[PDB]
Design a protein around this nucleic acid. Structure first.
Ligand code: MG
Length: 863
RNA sequence: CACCCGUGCAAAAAUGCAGGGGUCUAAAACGACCUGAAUAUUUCAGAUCAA
């Protein structure tokens, strides 16, 4: 399944002039040089400790055999022969868009006869892609509830507040909209950016810097998503030119987590440090703290080259720590067991690790990789056994009371040089994305930073290569941001420590308790006068608050609820849970082992029988079922009573209602996140082809103005009077549409599109108006087979409700008509408005055709 | 079981075999991370969360 070349230690194969070079795997993403090649003449490089020897060489292929771990012998192809097999016969390749020179011409100053510079640039374009996604999901959480879109840094608050007294209609409404923003309750969900702790309490920031926050991410969107022809295209890459109003707020928010961690570190982590001093009698306590700091905070147990937990999961599988006795003590155990291994492999077992890394690289099946983890595990279990049970028997409740109530004094002399830098040292770029992440979910943060560290590390490893070979590495004066890529990399690794750890929660307000019951269900006949009394009994205007805690612990403190209110609007959500099919599609994707865990709690005999009873249990759910919570809140969930058995029964139902509906809204906005990428790349590629001598035109009026110019076709009077021919395909403007089949099919689809529906298709995906109004659009559908179908029903029904009183054509009305007969998405209508990116073909196919969309749920092509 | 490319065979414009691709997609290898229903600087529960 996996490539034999990269198991033998081959990393890449570069082309320079007539010469050909070759690389190999080093430390992580470091690049080690190996044999160069000139027409069957190979000079070896790195004579000391080579990874693989090439045994046979020729013009069209390079054989190899590896020296590390599992010996693998493989084959490798020549770049210079690419596109030259059966037809000058040796020349550098070019990208499938035929756009290599203009990119080299822009970042760097000149064209090169290499392929090393272009592998670099396609990683720079991949961070603007990922930055173009999450900046859009951020603004939507603010915009959900024109102001946000036209927004820049040259308008400081002293200049913006002048528009209060303005006589103009726009400037007056622009400011009056700002006051309507800060005068909203929903900012409590964004407390990390909008609140500060200061008798003492937690309140909003000064009104000056709230503007500075949203102004700063508001241009991030308008920059990433657009081309920005002018001198503002270098905004993100020139952040040292900002006003002082923006730099200061970044420092204020970047320094509040570190001061929560490293101000007092010994006292809140006082338990684990004591429980370790017991096993490592011989070690000096001061350096142990240094290790436990850089283990826990900096996560240096996640850059080792292998996975510590997969070893952990295999060694203590059936050793008796999976009981319910070890539930609260569990994370205390895994934090330490992962440390005992980390200090093992760092100092004494360093050689046993390098063997593991060079083994997993040279593994061609997953059954091999899974075995070696289980091989090394039994060695670890017989070695680290008494130290483990010496930990578990120390975590027995009462012992933690004594260890938390105890006096200790330890020198921070060693530790204070491993601390995290404050905001005064790090750059504005790393501080910017931190601010951004505080408008996002959990799984979205990791995908952002984890993607960026790889793309900078990949950018690094090419720059050192081109130093070793004597090439022009100097960026142009405007893209000098990347010459310090070694710096911005490490800043992001520090950021991956505490971006996910610290979250500052607010004491719940009244309005949250209304959103908590609206999402959960309110009876029909109840009026506005009555619901404000329902919570008046919750908040007790003797005082019993057992119900206030139920609605705060099981609902508000859930990471699920914190997501649904950001991207949703809670009353739209309960109205959406009345779609039994979609709700049932989310249940039958869950394993039956989870279902039998939920069911046995919520019931007091097959899978699909249980799965129906959980559906209709969701469709009937109300706050009034939980108004009796004052009686059983105080009960402990683990005891054996009636209140406890009732309590967990009432808990899991909420945990199921929210968990199910977290998944639906998550997959749909992630599916939405792949089309914003597509319209980014359309305005990206348009300026590039236009610079290459081609003539496209304007695109904000017609999004199909590019892919026609790629073909060489046009419309004369609103439509295409040109027919199919092969002179166009062979004479296309990129390597994709040189083929005559997909040239033809896109032309067929493209002649039945229209200009108006496409320009609306952008404003529906880039603004997320499709799931902003989800219940209106998802009223009735027969079935749900995948999240691709569902999203493509909504965005079609959003266009029916938009094009209901307007002019349309025969092709559009025939598609909308097939949307009413069959209550689902018209497959031939997906690929009409999804035409504007046909100049890229494998993108067009993956987004228009199920089975090719998601790499985890594969299918079949159309043919 | 998607796209492109090199090779060997049968061909005569395209098909079988065996492989490669960071320069093809959300998408190179280990790893991190996601799919995922499974939060982590803090043992749990309870209590403390709008006047
Ligand atoms: Mg790529």
């Amino acid at each position: 399944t996996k490539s034999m070349a990269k198991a033998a230690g081959v990393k890449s194969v570069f082309a320079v002039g007539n010469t050909v070079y070759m690389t190999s795997f080093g430390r992580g993403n470091d690049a080690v040089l190996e044999q160069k090649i000139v027409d069957t003449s190979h000079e070896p490089l790195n004579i000391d400790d080579p990874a693989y020897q090439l045994n046979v060489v020729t013009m069209n292929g390079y054989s190899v055999t590896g020296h590390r771990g599992e010996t693998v012998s493989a084959v490798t192809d020549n770049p210079l022969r690419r596109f030259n097999g059966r037809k000058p016969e040796q020349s550098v390749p070019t990208d499938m868009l035929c756009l290599k020179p203009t990119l080299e011409k822009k970042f760097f100053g000149k064209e090169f006869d290499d392929n090393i510079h272009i592998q670099l640039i396609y990683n720079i374009l991949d961070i603007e892609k990922i930055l173009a996604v999450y900046s859009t999901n951020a603004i939507y959480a603010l915009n959900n509830m024109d102001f946000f879109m036209k927004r820049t840094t040259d308008e400081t608050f002293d200049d913006f507040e002048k528009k209060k007294e303005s006589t103009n209609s726009r400037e007056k409404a622009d400011f009056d909209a700002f006051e309507k923003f800060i005068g909203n309750y929903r900012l409590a969900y964004f407390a990390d950016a909008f609140y500060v702790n200061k008798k003492a309490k937690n309140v909003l920031r000064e009104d000056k810097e709230l503007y500075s926050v949203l102004t700063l991410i508001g241009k991030l969107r308008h920059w990433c998503v657009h081309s920005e022809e002018g001198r503002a295209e270098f905004w993100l890459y020139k952040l040292d030119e900002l006003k002082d109003d923006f730099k200061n707020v970044l420092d204020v928010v970047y320094n509040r987590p570190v001061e929560e961690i490293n101000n007092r570190f010994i006292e809140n982590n006082k338990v684990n440090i004591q429980i370790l001093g017991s096993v490592y009698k011989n070690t000096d306590i001061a350096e142990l703290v240094r290790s436990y700091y850089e283990f826990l905070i900096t996560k240096k147990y996640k850059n080792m080259g292998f996975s510590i937990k997969k070893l952990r999961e295999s060694m203590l599988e059936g050793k008796g720590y999976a009981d319910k006795e070890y539930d609260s003590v569990r994370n205390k155990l895994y934090q330490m067991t992962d440390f005992i291994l980390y200090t093992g492999y760092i100092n004494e077992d360093s050689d046993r690790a390098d063997d593991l890394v060079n083994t997993l690289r040279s593994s061609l099946k997953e059954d091999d990789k899974t075995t070696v983890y289980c091989k090394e595990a039994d060695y670890l279990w017989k070695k680290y056994r008494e130290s483990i049970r010496e930990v578990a028997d120390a975590l027995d409740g009462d012992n933690i009371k004594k260890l938390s109530k105890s006096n200790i004094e330890i020198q921070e002399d060693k530790l204070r040089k491993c601390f995290i830098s404050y905001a005064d040292s790090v750059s504005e770029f790393t501080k910017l994305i931190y601010l951004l992440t505080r408008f996002l979910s959990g799984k979205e943060i990791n995908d952002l930073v984890t993607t960026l560290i790889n793309k900078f590390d990949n950018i690094r490893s090419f720059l050192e290569i081109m130093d070793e070979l004597g090439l022009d590495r100097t960026f142009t004066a405007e893209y000098s941001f990347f010459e310090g890529s070694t710096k911005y990399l490490a800043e992001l690794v520090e950021l991956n420590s505490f971006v996910k750890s610290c979250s500052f929660d607010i004491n719940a307000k009244r309005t949250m308790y209304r959103d908590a019951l609206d999402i959960l269900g309110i009876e029909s006949d109840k009026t506005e006068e009555d619901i404000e009394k329902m919570i008046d009994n919750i908040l007790q205007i003797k005082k019993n608050n057992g119900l206030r805690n139920f609605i705060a612990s099981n609902v508000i403190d859930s990471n699920r609820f914190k997501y649904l209110v950001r991207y949703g609007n809670p009353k739209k959500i309960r109205e959406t849970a009345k779609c039994k099919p979609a709700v049932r599609f989310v249940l039958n994707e869950i394993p039956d082992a989870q279902i039998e865990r939920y069911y046995e709690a919520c019931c007091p005999c097959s899978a699909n029988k249980r799965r129906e009873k959980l559906a209709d249990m969701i469709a009937e759910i109300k706050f009034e079922n939980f108004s009796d919570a004052g009686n059983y809140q105080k009960a402990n969930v683990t005891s054996r009573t009636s209140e406890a058995e009732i309590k967990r029964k009432n808990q899991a139902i909420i945990r199921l209602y929210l968990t199910v509906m977290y998944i639906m809204l998550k997959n749909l906005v992630n599916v939405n996140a792949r089309y914003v990428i597509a319209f980014h790349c359309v305005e990206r590629d348009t300026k590039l082809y236009a610079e290459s001598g081609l003539e496209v035109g304007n695109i904000e009026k017609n999004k199909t103005n590019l892919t026609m110019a790629v073909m060489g076709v046009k419309l004369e009077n609103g439509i295409i009077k040109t027919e199919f021919d092969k002179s166009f395909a062979e004479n296309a403007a990129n390597r994709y549409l040189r083929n005559a089949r997909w040239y033809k099919l896109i032309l067929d689809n493209l002649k039945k599109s229209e200009r108006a529906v496409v320009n609306e298709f952008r404003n529906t995906v880039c603004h997320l108006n499709a799931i902003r109004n989800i219940n209106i659009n998802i009223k009735e559908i027969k079935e749900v087979e995948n999240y691709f179908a569902l999203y493509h029903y909504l965005i079609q029904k959003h266009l029916e409700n938009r094009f209901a009183d307007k002019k349309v054509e025969r092709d559009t009305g025939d598609f909308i008509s097939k949307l009413e007969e069959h209550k689902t998405y018209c497959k031939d209508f997906v690929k009409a408005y999804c035409t504007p990116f046909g100049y890229n073909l494998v993108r067009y196919k993956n987004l228009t055709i199920d089975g090719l969309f998601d790499k985890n749920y594969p299918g079949k092509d159309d043919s």
